[PDB]
RNA sequence: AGCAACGCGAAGAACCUUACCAGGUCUUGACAUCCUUUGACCACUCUAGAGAUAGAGCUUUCCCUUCGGGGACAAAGUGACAGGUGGUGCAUGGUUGUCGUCAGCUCGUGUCGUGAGAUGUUGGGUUAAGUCCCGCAACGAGCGCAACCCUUAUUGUUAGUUGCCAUCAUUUAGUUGGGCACUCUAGCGAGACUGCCGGUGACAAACCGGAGGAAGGUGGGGAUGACGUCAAAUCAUCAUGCCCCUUAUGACCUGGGCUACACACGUGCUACAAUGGGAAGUACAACGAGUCGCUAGACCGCGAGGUCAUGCAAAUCUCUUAAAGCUUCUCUCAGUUCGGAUUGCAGGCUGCAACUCGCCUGCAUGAAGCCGGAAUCGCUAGUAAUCGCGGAUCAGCACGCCGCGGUG
C-alpha cells in the first residue's frame, strides 16, 4: 500500500528505460522480487531469482499491478 | 515560593537524614520552611526466568523502589542562598533546586 | 448546625459520611441515592443500621464516596453510617455489635502467583 | 539447584549495595563503567589481595574505595603506585578519580580471601582434606560462630566428579538477621575446573 | 560464530530497521533489558552481589 | 475432608422477603456471578405468581418445596470389587439442596420464551403435585424401598 | 521426550536477528597483542555492480619539545598467531527441575553388646510440624520446623504540595481568596499473646465454648526449599580438560527456508443463542508508562486515521469517558437479525521495502456448528466462574506471558 507512488528499483527501471527504444531482450536478470509491474514492463521477459535459480516470466498485460515475486514460487511441493 | 527543593533516593533513612540537614540549616538562618512533604514512592517490577535453558514455569521477581521528598522555602534571605547552595552530603541522593 | 461524621472502608473503596437531623433521605456525590446506586436493592443493605439501632429516623445522610465498584462502595457506605451512629450515642455499641455492622471486611483480591493461570487455578494436565 | 545466594537474600535488609549512586537517563553508561572499572582492577588484585570495592560518584568525579590486606604493597614506596592507579583509571573513565584505600582487619574472617587462598593450594598439588581443615581451624581461632567449606569437581585430578566439605560450629542460613558471608572461586590442578565455596558466620 | 557478530553489531547499521540490541557482558541477543543493557541471566547474577543499585528481591 | 467435619457456610437473608430460602434460590439461578439478573428473574416470577391465581409467593413456594424434596435416597457403593446400591436416610440440608436443584434444573428445560414464564409456571405445577420434579422425587422413592433388598444388612 | 518434553530456550523470524540452503567473493584475516618502516587514520563526490567491492576526484597531515621523544593510526612486511553456535552434560565449574516446603539428617558424655552395632531418635496422646506433654538408660547439643523480612485488615503522632474541601464568597468547575478538619500520601510508634472466663482431658500438653476488640488461635498472602534421589537438563548465556578444522567447519554480500501439508498428539481462543442479538441514554476502579516520548483541543474522513497546534522529564499534563452493569425501544425459538470461518474489491500505518510473509478499516459473501462416547482436568472463599485495564520485549506485529481491579 504505497499510495505515495509505487515501488520500483533503480537498477530495474534503469535497464527497462535503456531498452525502451527497440525490440527487447530476454536478458533482464535481476533479483529484485519486491518491485511491482509498471505498465512499461510489457512485452519484455524478466528473470526472477527464486532463491536458487533465475526463472523467466513473460509480462502480459493482465499482470500490471502485481509484484515480480508472484510469478516465481520458492517452495517446490510435489 | 520562589525557592523549592526535590530529593530522590533509594533509602528513606538517608533521605530523611539529608532532609533534616537542609531544614535545620535553613531555619537556623531564616524562618518558615514548609515541612519535608512525602511523595508517593514510585515502584517497578522485573520478572525473570531463573534457569539457563528450560523450565519457564518457575521465575524470580525483582523490584526497585524510588523514595521522594519535597521541601519548599518561604521568604529567603541573602544568607540562605549562600548557606544552602554549599552543603552537599551525601553521595547517592538526587538534589534539584528550582526557583 | 450539629453533625456527625464517620469513615467507612470496604474493598478498595472509602466513604466519608455525615449524619444530620432531618426526615430520612440520603444523597451521594450531589445525586440522589435512588439514581447513584440504582441497581435493585443495595439500598436496603444501606439502611440496615437505622433498621437495627436508633430505630429508625430521622437523619439526612450526606456522603462522599470514591473507589471500587457499585457493590463495594455501598457496603462501605453502610460501614460509615454505622460508625457515625455509634458517635451519636455510645449506648449503640451493643445492638450494632451483635449484628456485625461495625467491623471492616478484610476480603481483598488475592494476588496472582507465577506459573499459575490465576491466584489458584492451574493449567490443564495430561498424565501422558 | 535449591539454595538462594546468601548475600542476595540479605541485600537491602541488613547490608547495603556495593554501588551507591543515584542516576536516571545516565544509568546504562554508569553501570557499564562500574563493570569496566571493577573488571580492570583485578590486575593488582592478582597480588595485593583485595576483597571489595565501593564506587561512589559526584558531578564529574568518581570516588573509589578498596579494601585490601596489603597497604604498602599497593600504594608504593612514598606514594608512587596510587599515582599510577589514578593516571590509568583516568584513561578509561575520562573523569577525575580519587581512590581512598581502606585496610582490612582480621583477614582470615573473610569469604573471598579464605576461599581464594585455599583454592591456590589445589593448584600446587596439595591434598584437599587438610586444606579445608586448616582453613576452618585458622578461621575459628580468629573467633567466629561457624564456618563451612566445600570443594567440587574432579578431585585428586581423577575421574568422575564428586563433592565434599567440612563444617565447624553453627551456620544458620534461614535466619535473616545473621550477617553471613559467602564467595565462590575457581582453580585447576591439571584437569578441568574446580569450585570452592565458603560461608562464615560472624554473629549479627 | 560469536566474535564476528559482536563486531558486526557495533558498526553502524545499513538501514534504520537493522540495528538490534545485545547484552554487554555476553553477546546474548534474546531477552535483554534496555534500561540496564543486560540479558536475562546476567541481571539475576549481578543483582546478587548488590552491584546494580536499586534492584532487589520483591515479595508482597 | 480427612481431619473431620467442617462448617456450614452461613447465608445472608435477602431483605425483600427476609427469607434465607429465597436467597439460596437466587444463588442457584445465578450463572457467572451475574446476580442482579437472577434477582430480577426471581422477582418477576413471584410477581407473575401472585398476579395470576395466587395468594402470596412465599406460601405456594414453600408448599412446592415440601412436595418436591426427597426423604429416601440411595448410595451406590463399592465393597471389594463388586458394586451395588443401598438406601439411607437424608439429613435436612441435603433435602433442601436437592429440592432447589431439581426445581431449577427442570425449569431450565421447559421450552417457553422466558426464564420467568418457566420458573413461575414450574413451581406452580409443583405446588399441585405435578411436574418432572415431583416425578423425579417419586423415581427416587421407587428406586429406594426396592433396592433395600441388597441393603438390608449393609 | 512419562509424571518432572510439547503458548518450552524464543520477554517479539518480512531484511537484521540467523547457526541452515543456492549463487557472488577474501585469506595475518570481520576481532587481539607484539616487532619494524614509522607515525597524525579520514570522511565526502562520480562512474560499474544485486550488493560485497573495484576504478577515478579536495585529501587521512605532528596537537611533547630542552633540537635530542612519546599518544591516536592506514598500508606493508612479518610470523608468532587469531577464529569455531565443530564433538564429548557419561571428563567438569556454574545455573535449574522433581520427590516437596514433605519433616527429616547427625554429634558429645553415659549405658548396653565378644564384635560390626544399638540407645537416644522406641511407646501412649497431641500437632501443619523430630511441634509439645507423660513414661522410659539415658542426659544434653547442632543443621532443619517456627520466629526475625515484605504486603494487606484497625489507629495515635509528625508533615500539608502538585493531594483534600467540612464552617465561608465565587465562577464552567476546588478554581481563587482561605484552611490542613476529613480522605490521601509516608516516616516513627501501638495492637493478637491461648493473653483472661467455662467445660473435656492423666490436674499435663492440647481441644471445644464465651467476653472484649478492626482482627482469634501459624488473622490472609508472599519470600525463604535440609542430608539426599533421577550418570535428570544445559559445552548454544558464560567459562573450561581432552579431541577435531585451518586458501576452511574461518570471514563478507544478495535472494531464499525457519511460516512447507494425504495426517496424528498437546495447550488455548470464538461459538452452538432469549440468563440472548441490535439501537439510544446513564454510572462506578486499580496496578503501571512517557523526551525526540505520552498528545490536550479544533477541524477534514462512514471508518481505520490525517492536518494545524497544546501541556508535560511528571500526586501538577497525557496515555485513561474501563467492560460486564442499569434504563428504554425493538426482535420471537428459526441454521435464524445466532455464529463469523473463507473468498472479491477499495483503503490506512510503520518501514529503504509488507509477493513468499505484517497489523488494522469499509462494502460484498455467509462454512462447520443446535452443548459434544470411552476417557480425562482445575478448584475449599473474595476462591471457582465471568469482565475489562496496564507493560516487559518492540518501527511495526500477542488468542501467549507477568500484574491489576469489578460482579461474585
Ligand atoms: Zn548477559
Automatic annotation (TrEMBL), chain B:
Subunit description: Part of the 30S ribosomal subunit.
Top-rank lineage group of the source organism: Bacteria
Small ribosomal subunit protein uS10 domain: residues covered: 4-98
Protein name listed in UniProt: Small ribosomal subunit protein uS10
Organism encoding this protein: Enterococcus faecalis
Sequence similarity: Belongs to the universal ribosomal protein uS10 family.
Keyword Ribosomal protein carried by entry: yes
GO MF annotation: an example: structural constituent of ribosome
Entry keyword set: Ribonucleoprotein, Ribosomal protein
A cellular component annotation (GO) from this entry: ribosome
Function summary: Involved in the binding of tRNA to the ribosomes.
GO-annotated biological processes: translation
InterPro entries: Ribosomal_uS10, Ribosomal_uS10_CS, Ribosomal_uS10_dom, Ribosomal_uS10_dom_sf
TrEMBL record, chain C:
Record has Hydrolase as a keyword: no
InterPro entries: Ribosomal_Su5_D2-typ_SF, Ribosomal_uS9, Ribosomal_uS9_bac/plastid, Ribosomal_uS9_CS, Ribsml_uS5_D2-typ_fold_subgr
GO terms classed as biological process: translation
Source domain of life: Bacteria
The entry's keywords: Ribonucleoprotein, Ribosomal protein
Family: Belongs to the universal ribosomal protein uS9 family.
Protein name as it appears in the record: Small ribosomal subunit protein uS9
Organism whose genome encodes this protein: Enterococcus faecalis (Streptococcus faecalis)
Automatic annotation (TrEMBL), chain E:
Co-factor remark: Binds 1 zinc ion per subunit.
Binding site for Zn(2+): 23, 26, 39, 42
Keyword Zinc-finger tagged: no
GO cellular component: small ribosomal subunit
PROSITE patterns referenced in this protein's UniProt entry, alphabetically: RIBOSOMAL_S14
Entry keyword annotation includes rRNA-binding: yes
Transmembrane segments: none
One GO MF term attached to the UniProt entry: zinc ion binding
GO BP field: translation
InterPro entries in the record: Ribosomal_uS14 (IPR001209), Ribosomal_uS14_bact (IPR023053), Ribosomal_uS14_CS (IPR018271), Ribosomal_uS14_sf (IPR043140)
Binding site for Zn(2+) 2: 39
Keyword annotations: Metal-binding, Ribonucleoprotein, Ribosomal protein, RNA-binding, rRNA-binding, Zinc
Cofactor(s) listed in the protein's UniProt record: Zn(2+)
Residues that, per the record, bind Zn(2+) 1: 23, 26, 39, 42
Subunit-structure text: Part of the 30S ribosomal subunit. Contacts proteins S3 and S10.
Function: Binds 16S rRNA, required for the assembly of 30S particles and may also be responsible for determining the conformation of the 16S rRNA at the A site.
Family statement drawn from the similarity comment of this UniProt entry: Belongs to the universal ribosomal protein uS14 family. Zinc-binding uS14 subfamily.
Name the record gives this protein: Small ribosomal subunit protein uS14
Organism the protein comes from: Enterococcus faecalis
The organism's taxonomic lineage, starting at the top: Bacteria, Bacillati, Bacillota, Bacilli, Lactobacillales
UniProtKB/TrEMBL annotation, chain F:
Coiled coil: none
Family matches, as InterPro entries: Ribosomal_uS7, Ribosomal_uS7_bac/org-type, Ribosomal_uS7_CS, Ribosomal_uS7_dom, Ribosomal_uS7_dom_sf
Keyword set, alphabetical order: Ribonucleoprotein, Ribosomal protein, RNA-binding, rRNA-binding, tRNA-binding
GO cellular component term of the entry, any: small ribosomal subunit
Gene Ontology MF term list: rRNA binding; structural constituent of ribosome; tRNA binding
GO biological process: translation
Domain Small ribosomal subunit protein uS7 span(s) in chain numbering: 1-148
Gene3D superfamilies hit by this protein: Ribosomal protein S7 domain (1.10.455.10)
Pfam short name (any one): Ribosomal_S7
Role played: One of the primary rRNA binding proteins, it binds directly to 16S rRNA where it nucleates assembly of the head domain of the 30S subunit. Is located at the subunit interface close to the decoding center, probably blocks exit of the E-site tRNA.
PANTHER family the record matches: RIBOSOMAL PROTEIN S7
NCBIfam families: rpsG_bact
Assembly and interaction partners: Part of the 30S ribosomal subunit. Contacts proteins S9 and S11.
Family per record: Belongs to the universal ribosomal protein uS7 family.
Name of protein: Small ribosomal subunit protein uS7
Amino acid at each position: 500500500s504505497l499510495k505515495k507512488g509505487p515501488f520500483v528499483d533503480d537498477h530495474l527501471m534503469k535497464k527497462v528505460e535503456a531498452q525502451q527504444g527497440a525490440e527487447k531482450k530476454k536478458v533482464i536478470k535481476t533479483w529484485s522480487r519486491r518491485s511491482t509491474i509498471f505498465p512499461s514492463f510489457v512485452g519484455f521477459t524478466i528473470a526472477v531469482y527464486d532463491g536458487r535459480k533465475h526463472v523467466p516470466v513473460y509480462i502480459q498485460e493482465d499482470m500490471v499491478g502485481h509484484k515480480l515475486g508472484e510469478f516465481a514460487p520458492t517452495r517446490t511441493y510435489r | 515560593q520562589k525557592i523549592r527543593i526535590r530529593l530522590k533516593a533509594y533509602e528513606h533513612r538517608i533521605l530523611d537524614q539529608s532532609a533534616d540537614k537542609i531544614v535545620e540549616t535553613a531555619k537556623r538562618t531564616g524562618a518558615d520552611v514548609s515541612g519535608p512533604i512525602p511523595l508517593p514512592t514510585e515502584r517497578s517490577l522485573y520478572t525473570v526466568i531463573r534457569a539457563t535453558h528450560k523450565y519457564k514455569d518457575s521465575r524470580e521477581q525483582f523490584e526497585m523502589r524510588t523514595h521522594k521528598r519535597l521541601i519548599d522555602i518561604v521568604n529567603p534571605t541573602p544568607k540562605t542562598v549562600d548557606a544552602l547552595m554549599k552543603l552537599d552530603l551525601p553521595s547517592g541522593v538526587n538534589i534539584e533546586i528550582k526557583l | 448546625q450539629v453533625q456527625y461524621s464517620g469513615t467507612g472502608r470496604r474493598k478498595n473503596a472509602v466513604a466519608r459520611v455525615r449524619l444530620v437531623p432531618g426526615t430520612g433521605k440520603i444523597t451521594v456525590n450531589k445525586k440522589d441515592v435512588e439514581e447513584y446506586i440504582p441497581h435493585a436493592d443495595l439500598r436496603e443493605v444501606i439502611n440496615q443500621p437505622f433498621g437495627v439501632t436508633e430505630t429508625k429516623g430521622a437523619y439526612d445522610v450526606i456522603v462522599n464516596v470514591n473507589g471500587g465498584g457499585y457493590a463495594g462502595q455501598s457496603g462501605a457506605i453502610r460501614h460509615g453510617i454505622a460508625r457515625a451512629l455509634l458517635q451519636v450515642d455510645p449506648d449503640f455499641r451493643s445492638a450494632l455489635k451483635r449484628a456485625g455492622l461495625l467491623t471492616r471486611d478484610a476480603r481483598m483480591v488475592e494476588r496472582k502467583k507465577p506459573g499459575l493461570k490465576k491466584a489458584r487455578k492451574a493449567s490443564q494436565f495430561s498424565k501422558r | 539447584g535449591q539454595k538462594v545466594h546468601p548475600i542476595g537474600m540479605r541485600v537491602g535488609i541488613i547490608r547495603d549495595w556495593d554501588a551507591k549512586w543515584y542516576a536516571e537517563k545516565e544509568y546504562a553508561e554508569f553501570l557499564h563503567e562500574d563493570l569496566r572499572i571493577r573488571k580492570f582492577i583485578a590486575t593488582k588484585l592478582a597480588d595485593a589481595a583485595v576483597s571489595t570495592i565501593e564506587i561512589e560518584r559526584a558531578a564529574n568525579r568518581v570516588n573509589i574505595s578498596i579494601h585490601t590486606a596489603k597497604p604498602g604493597m599497593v600504594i608504593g614506596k612514598g606514594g608512587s603506585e596510587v599515582e599510577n592507579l589514578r593516571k590509568e583509571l583516568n584513561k578509561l573513565t575520562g573523569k577525575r578519580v580519587h581512590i581512598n584505600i581502606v585496610e582490612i582487619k582480621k583477614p582470615d574472617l573473610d569469604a573471598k580471601l579464605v576461599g581464594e587462598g585455599i583454592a591456590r593450594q589445589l593448584e600446587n598439588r596439595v591434598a584437599f582434606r587438610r586444606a579445608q581443615k586448616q582453613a576452618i581451624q585458622r578461621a575459628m581461632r580468629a573467633g567466629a560462630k561457624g564456618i563451612k567449606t566445600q570443594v567440587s569437581g574432579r578431585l585428586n585430578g581423577a575421574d568422575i566428579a564428586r563433592s565434599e566439605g567440612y563444617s565447624e560450629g553453627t551456620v544458620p542460613l534461614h535466619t535473616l538477621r545473621a550477617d553471613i558471608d559467602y564467595a565462590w572461586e575457581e582453580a585447576d590442578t591439571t584437569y578441568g575446573k574446580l569450585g570452592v565455596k565458603v560461608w562464615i558466620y560472624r554473629g549479627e | 560464530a560469536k566474535k564476528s557478530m559482536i563486531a558486526k553489531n557495533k558498526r553502524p547499521a545499513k538501514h534504520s530497521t537493522q540495528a538490534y540490541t545485545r547484552c554487554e557482558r555476553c553477546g546474548r541477543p534474546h531477552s535483554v533489558y534496555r534500561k540496564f543493557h543486560l540479558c536475562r541471566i546476567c541481571f539475576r547474577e549481578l543483582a546478587y552481589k548488590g552491584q546494580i543499585p536499586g534492584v532487589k528481591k520483591a515479595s508482597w | 475432608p480427612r481431619k473431620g467435619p467442617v462448617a456450614k457456610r452461613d447465608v445472608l437473608p435477602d431483605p425483600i422477603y427476609n427469607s434465607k430460602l429465597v436467597t439460596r434460590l437466587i444463588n442457584r439461578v445465578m450463572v457467572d456471578g451475574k446476580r442482579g439478573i437472577a434477582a430480577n428473574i426471581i422477582y418477576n416470577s413471584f410477581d407473575i405468581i401472585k398476579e395470576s391465581t395466587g395468594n402470596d409467593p412465599l406460601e405456594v413456594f414453600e408448599q412446592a418445596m415440601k412436595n418436591v424434596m426427597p426423604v429416601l435416597e440411595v448410595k451406590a457403593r463399592r465393597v471389594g470389587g463388586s458394586n451395588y446400591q443401598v438406601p439411607v436416610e437424608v439429613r435436612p440440608e441435603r433435602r433442601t439442596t436437592l429440592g432447589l436443584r431439581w426445581v431449577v434444573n427442570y425449569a431450565r428445560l421447559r421450552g417457553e420464551h422466558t426464564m420467568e414464564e418457566r420458573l413461575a409456571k414450574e413451581i406452580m405445577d409443583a405446588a399441585n403435585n405435578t411436574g418432572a420434579s415431583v416425578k423425579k422425587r417419586e423415581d427416587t422413592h421407587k428406586m429406594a424401598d426396592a433396592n433395600r433388598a441388597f441393603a438390608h444388612y449393609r
